[PDB]
Design a protein around this ligand. Structure first.
Ligand code: MG
Ligand code: MG
Ligand code: MG
Ligand code: MG
Ligand code: MG
Ligand code: MG
Ligand code: MG
Ligand code: MG
Ligand code: MG
Ligand code: MG
Ligand code: MG
Ligand code: MG
Ligand code: MG
Ligand code: MG
Ligand code: MG
Ligand code: MG
Ligand code: MG
Ligand code: MG
Ligand code: MG
Ligand code: MG
Ligand code: MG
Ligand code: MG
Ligand code: MG
Ligand code: MG
Ligand code: MG
Ligand code: MG
Ligand code: MG
Ligand code: MG
Ligand code: MG
Ligand code: MG
Ligand code: MG
Ligand code: MG
Ligand code: MG
Ligand code: MG
Ligand code: MG
Ligand code: MG
Ligand code: MG
Ligand code: MG
Ligand code: MG
Ligand code: MG
Ligand code: MG
Ligand code: MG
Ligand code: MG
Ligand code: MG
Ligand code: MG
Ligand code: MG
Ligand code: MG
Ligand code: MG
Ligand code: MG
Ligand code: MG
Ligand code: MG
Ligand code: MG
Ligand code: MG
Lengths: 271, 93, 46
RNA sequence: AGGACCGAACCGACUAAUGUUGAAAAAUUAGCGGAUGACUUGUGGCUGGGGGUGAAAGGCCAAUCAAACCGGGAGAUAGCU
RNA sequence: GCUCGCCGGAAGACCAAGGGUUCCUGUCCAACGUUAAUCGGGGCAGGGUGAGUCGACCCCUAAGGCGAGGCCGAAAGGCGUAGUCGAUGGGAAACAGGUUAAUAUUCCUGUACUUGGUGUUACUGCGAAGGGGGGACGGAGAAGGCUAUGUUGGCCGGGCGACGGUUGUCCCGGUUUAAGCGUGUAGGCUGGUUUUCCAGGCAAAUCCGGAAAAUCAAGGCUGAGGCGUGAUGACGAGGCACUACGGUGCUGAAGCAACAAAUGCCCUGCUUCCAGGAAAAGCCUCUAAGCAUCAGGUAACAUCAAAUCGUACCCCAAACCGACACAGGUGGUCAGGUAGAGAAUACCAAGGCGCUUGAGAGAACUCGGGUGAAGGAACUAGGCAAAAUGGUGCCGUAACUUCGGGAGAAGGCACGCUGAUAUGUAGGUGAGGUCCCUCGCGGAUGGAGCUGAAAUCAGUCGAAGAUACCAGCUGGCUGCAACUGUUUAUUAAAAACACAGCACUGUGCAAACACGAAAGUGGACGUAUACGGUGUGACGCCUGCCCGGUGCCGGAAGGUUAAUU
């Protein structure tokens, strides 16, 4: 549910929270946790390579099963959980053989719901099948790009792909970007949309809420001196040049994709 | 078991001082200068062999040498090891 | 006011000590120069 | 509940006077701002010179910065004193 | 030595870091010490640091470093796997009393505990680099139970007062005791126990996980404190005897209760929130290979061992960082009384100090303060500076508003002491007694003693009762920036930067992009509700026309056009 905070202080006035009462209040399932320490956006040469990354809360990594290859064994959803490492929620599932795993939580999934993977699974949300076995027109998520590699497309809160066509060894997918892409029909997909679609209604409300998430401040190029940025300089607010990145490349319209290896799979660019 | 050659090198001298004199009279403890690399086990063995007494326990410490001016040139005395060797009650060295 | 030299013997040794000098070609060239000059103290090690 | 309120420690540095061969190569005194947070602090680590780092002042990078310091090319060159 | 003054959340005490003999004793006064110096952190000599349980070393990992092979690179080298290092974190165990001129949880006395090796006895399925559990983890909040600690009474010892009074509802001092061992308490968490089966836990598993039955209603784990014991001991106000008057020798009474009470402990708890909160070992457990009446494991007993290095001294400072015996800087720990909301403030305790030039004088002027007739901003670029306001309770409070605010708006009244209500109230605490008891660190009733606000009435002193210290000036119109934040270390704190929000644009994952001759790495163990760039800058109402110029995007007929031939 989406709740507006009352304006008892100026930093609360514009806050909008996404509050989900279904989520587990306790700690996560410890056997499926690992550490993930932070980078500050610094590579192994120690230099900043991605700007504006730093601080925020400590986070444990939850091992999520994107492969969904434990075929023929039913699983029951034990609970939905908050995962700090991503926009979607996750679901702890218990397989009939006693194994527990985390998966992405689809829209509509609740505790007690049964799921299954493989060629002979039912067409039901949370079930995973090869896209050869999924009807054309279906909405899916967590779509593999290569058979066996694990889901890479449509993982974020509220996302999904549509299977628009089937042509021999390939299916055509419409992605959230609007791109039409071919993928091998052997690739797996999970039926349904990713849950937590209200994620995009949140309003952070104050500067510190972005700092909690490990985003550091952006300084505008035009606020700088010429030595620092192409936009830098001027006595007063001045500009008078074509907008560029800090490294001098045009940043308003100039296309940057250059991958002749994967061009064959792209039926239609997002436009 | 320690070789007798080793035991004949570990004890260097008795230490004379008011603290040492009081240690002997009140606590039946002899104070010795010992080899820098001497262990409590070697000191105990050497005392029992060479002084022919029975040793209760050995406590040891390293004394750091003083920095001293000889004329103008600066010099430093050597570090050395001191042993407080407690004898059994009626030994009487 | 807080001045520039804030001593730490661990940091001193790790930054400028004998083993740090020996770990690289350029460090070994420091030692070579200082030996050639005839320095009494090659490094900060003590 | 809160980058909520008053206010010590703690962090800062708005005003004034003193000091200006100083008590001090940036402080003292009286007042001043924040004070559960985008807070503050200890230890250790990483980023290196057309390079870093910068909530951006050309700021900071050992009392040095519109290109650090040390050695070298080197007795640079100086229609100038 | 006697007085006086100063600090006392420190100007006292204990550490880390850093220093390294500055520590203690004797001796010296040339130089050093902003003067003198018999003194000294000065010179000279001698002494002084005692550990199975403190700390390091050691075992274990974090960030990160190094890295066999490897991949990559003119060379030098870069990156990284297996590994191996790396604490600021996890991992066994000791307390009280005494003692030196100078160390002490290290020495002595008393009383404990831990780990490991041997050996004896009894029983026995033992075994890992592998599996599982544990270790193992956030912020905020509330309340209860406690203790440290303090106050009062009692008790014991001492006193009867330099000047009116002081045998008492009088004055001064003491009234201390650990770890361990036993007890398992306030309280917290969890349903137990037994069989059968199993696509899981890189193979196995009696372990964990899952499924199904039967059966039982209490079973287990965690836990401050209290009490007992430790302890017929130790310590003890003082008193007595010496003194080489420096300090030793001898002896020791009481040693209880109530009430108050932490920011410490129960608490790694409980409640709640979103921003969702290390790892690895020690530890427990399961088995593999293998051993298989052996080794090996468990329990009791005895014995041996527990090395090495640090331990002096300063440590908000004359010993560290600042050239100085320098108004500077420097992390952690302890936290008495009265008053007070308080770690503020004033005055004190324990404890520590008077800041290493003095003596006079009492000019101008300078500095830091006090008070000021009448006037009251007339001063000045400018109320700069100063003066003023200042507490608690209660009454009362406007425009405007995003309905929270504005607000402590503004403004006003009360406030001391004594007595009474009530020889100390409401409230808190709760002894004895009594009753019960699934019987104890138990439940009910009971109210002694103790503690103790606030209010009202009456009186009373002063010029003045929030008496000192401490402690908002207030209001009106307006520009700018929404706001809290950030900034030119050392002349600029702002209207500048940032910000939540908005938009454009790139990016389909071996992503764009950035660092890098490369290998790689960040982006991200993310995947278009995501990530990068650029501009604008909460919110409200909005955001008009121009594609000629310069850029970018799409186009692919034609013109022109490279290497090549
Ligand atoms: Mg993240
Ligand atoms: Mg932005
Ligand atoms: Mg600028
Ligand atoms: Mg440029
Ligand atoms: Mg202009
Ligand atoms: Mg113009
Ligand atoms: Mg001993
Ligand atoms: Mg605040
Ligand atoms: Mg404020
Ligand atoms: Mg400080
Ligand atoms: Mg300023
Ligand atoms: Mg001040
Ligand atoms: Mg405040
Ligand atoms: Mg400028
Ligand atoms: Mg500088
Ligand atoms: Mg240059
Ligand atoms: Mg030349
Ligand atoms: Mg020249
Ligand atoms: Mg005083
Ligand atoms: Mg004070
Ligand atoms: Mg000396
Ligand atoms: Mg001395
Ligand atoms: Mg003289
Ligand atoms: Mg003199
Ligand atoms: Mg001396
Ligand atoms: Mg020792
Ligand atoms: Mg490593
Ligand atoms: Mg190699
Ligand atoms: Mg490497
Ligand atoms: Mg290691
Ligand atoms: Mg440590
Ligand atoms: Mg001492
Ligand atoms: Mg008590
Ligand atoms: Mg506190
Ligand atoms: Mg000491
Ligand atoms: Mg002085
Ligand atoms: Mg000083
Ligand atoms: Mg005068
Ligand atoms: Mg004056
Ligand atoms: Mg005045
Ligand atoms: Mg006047
Ligand atoms: Mg007047
Ligand atoms: Mg007037
Ligand atoms: Mg005027
Ligand atoms: Mg005038
Ligand atoms: Mg003023
Ligand atoms: Mg004033
Ligand atoms: Mg105007
Ligand atoms: Mg502002
Ligand atoms: Mg600053
Ligand atoms: Mg400045
Ligand atoms: Mg990559
Ligand atoms: Mg702007």
């Amino acid at each position: 549910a989406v709740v507006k905070c009352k304006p008892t202080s100026p930093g609360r006035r514009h806050v909008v929270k996404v509050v989900n009462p279904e989520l587990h209040k306790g700690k996560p399932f410890a056997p499926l946790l690992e550490k993930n320490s932070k980078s500050g956006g610094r590579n192994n040469n120690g230099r900043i390579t991605t700007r504006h990354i730093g601080g925020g809360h400590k986070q444990a990594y939850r091992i999520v099963d994107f492969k969904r290859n434990k075929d023929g064994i039913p699983a029951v959803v034990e609970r939905l959980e908050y995962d700090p490492n991503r926009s979607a929620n996750i679901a702890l599932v218990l397989y009939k053989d006693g194994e527990r795993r985390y998966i992405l939580a689809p829209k509509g999934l609740k505790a007690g719901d049964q799921i299954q993977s493989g060629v002979d699974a039912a067409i039901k949300p949370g079930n995973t099948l090869p896209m050869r076995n999924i009807p054309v027109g279906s909405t899916v998520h967590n779509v593999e790009m290569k058979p066996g590699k694990g889901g890479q497309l449509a993982r974020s809160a509220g996302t999904y792909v549509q299977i628009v066509a089937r042509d021999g060894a390939y299916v055509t997918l419409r992605l959230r970007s609007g791109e039409m892409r071919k993928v091998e029909a052997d690739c797996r997909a999970t039926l349904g949309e990713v849950g937590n679609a209200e994620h995009m209604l949140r309003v952070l409300g104050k500067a510190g809420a972005a700092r909690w998430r490990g985003v550091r401040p952006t300084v505008r190029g035009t606020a700088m001196n010429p030595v620092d940025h192409p936009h830098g300089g001027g006595e007063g607010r001045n500009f008078g040049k074509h907008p560029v990145t800090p490294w001098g490349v045009q940043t308003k319209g100039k296309k940057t994709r250059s991958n002749k290896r994967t061009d064959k799979f792209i039926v239609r660019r997002r436009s | 078991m320690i070789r007798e050659e080793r035991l004949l090198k570990v004890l260097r001298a008795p230490h004379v001082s008011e603290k040492a004199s009081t240690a002997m009279e009140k606590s039946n403890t002899i104070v010795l200068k010992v080899a820098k690399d001497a262990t409590k086990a070697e000191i105990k063995a050497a005392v029992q062999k060479l002084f022919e007494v029975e040793v209760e326990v050995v406590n040891t410490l390293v004394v750091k040498g003083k920095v001293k001016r000889h004329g103008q040139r600066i010099g430093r005395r050597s570090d050395w090891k001191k042993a407080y060797v407690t004898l059994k009650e009626g030994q009487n060295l | 006011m807080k001045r520039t030299f804030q001593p730490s013997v661990l940091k001193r040794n790790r930054s400028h000590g004998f083993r740090a000098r020996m770990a690289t070609k350029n460090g070994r060239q420091v030692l070579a120069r200082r030996r050639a000059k005839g320095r009494a103290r090659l490094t900060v090690s003590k």
